Amino acid sequence: KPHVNIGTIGHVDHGKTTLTAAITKVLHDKFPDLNETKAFDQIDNAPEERQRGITINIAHVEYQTDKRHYAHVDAPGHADYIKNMITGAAQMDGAILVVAATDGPMPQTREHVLLARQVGVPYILVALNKADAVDDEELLELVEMEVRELLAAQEFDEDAPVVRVSALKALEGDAKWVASVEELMNAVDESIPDPVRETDKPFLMPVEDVFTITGRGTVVTGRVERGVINVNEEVEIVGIRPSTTKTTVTGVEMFRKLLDQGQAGDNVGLLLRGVKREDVERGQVVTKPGTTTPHTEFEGQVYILSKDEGGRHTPFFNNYRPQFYFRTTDVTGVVTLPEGTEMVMPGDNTNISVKLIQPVAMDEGLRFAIREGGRTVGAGRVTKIIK
Ligand SMILES: Nc1nc2c(ncn2[C@@H]2O[C@H](COP(=O)(O)OP(=O)(O)O)[C@@H](O)[C@H]2O)c(=O)[nH]1
Ligand SMILES: [Mg+2]
Secondary structure (H helix, E strand, O other): EEEEEEEEOOOOOOHHHHHHHHHHHHHHHHOOOOOOOOHHHHHHHHOEEEEEEEEEOOOOOOOOOOOOOOEEEEEOOHEEEHHHHHHHHOOOOEEEEEOOOOOOOOHHHHHHHHHHHHOOHHHHEEEEOOOOOOOOOHHHHHHHHHHHHHHOOOOOOOOOOEEEEEOOOOOOOOOOHHHHHHHHHHHHHHHOOOOOOOOOOOOOEEEEOOOOEOOOEEEOOOOOEEEOEEOEEEEEOOOOOOOEEOOOEEEEOOOOOOOEEEOOEEEEEEEOOOOOHHHOOOOEEEEEOOOEEEEEEEEEEOOOEEEEEHOOOEEEEEOOOEEEEEEOOOEEEEOOOOOOOOOOOOOOEEEEEEEEEOOOOOOOOOOOEEEOOEEEEEEEEEEEEOO
């Protein structure tokens, strides 16, 4: 019964919210287990979400098929999709592209799929909507060519399936189009690959602080993001200071217990053999040995907080010196703007190149904040690393 994060993406007036309403409905009349059929009113008039200091407008919805339980996310505004995806309100494990068969792919449709590659969304599949209105069959055929050629150039594939649906007629109970969105949810079931168990990910916990206890005890604290660790297994601290450390954890303890295994998500304290207190910093990470290494230069995709959200006032140029909150620490780096971009306004999303004065353990698809002395001015995700 795996849990999966998906969402509808596409142009405005193309019927993303309708299909989301149809999807939840089609499974609620067809399942006692599936949650309340949500109506267009409460999905379209989406609530307001504030995460990491950024304001969003996101509609969360849950439903489950017989193969997976899903966590669906929809937004009203296009910019909200820019916000959500880059700032991770939906660490999406799949995505449903919505292409209205009347218009076809529009700038956002390309912009959404493009941005899907920037944040590492593994799969995108297509829901050819509004087929209740298109007479011509060979027009529909071509509408599939433009898309499948949009998804092919953005490193996706022919493997991804296009499903002609009607988000309206299925929503209105028409058994011919109700079955159409039914096939979608089976494609959704099989096409999107199974998202890895956060337990089965390789071990990773960011360091939060460090103290001296007993005589030989130098505890490190943090909440495990990835994986689990067995007591006395070698770990690897990763580069707030320039070097790469290596030590064998000798005791893990959560609250009253002193476990031999800490799970992903647990607030845990790790006692270590072979380093002292002055060898560990916030933002350092205790990885499984050799799984991850710390880089210094990378290529990211960042969203800048706008005037209305308390974002930066002056636009910034190359050789911009902010801090980058990679995990539990603010590391200062310098910017180079992409060829063609001379200035970054508030509001603007952009690709970006960054050189850090520090080394930081990082992988692609890692959220980070951009701050002016603690005050966050933006956020983003790693897209490409260099050196
Ligand atoms: N005929 C038809 N109209 C649709 C369909 N899906 C959505 N619409 C229309 O599209 C309009 C906006 O739908 P909505 O889901 O809010 O679009 P989005 O949120 O921008 O993706 C509504 O007035 C619907 O009547 C469909 O499958 N068939
Ligand atoms: Mg919408």
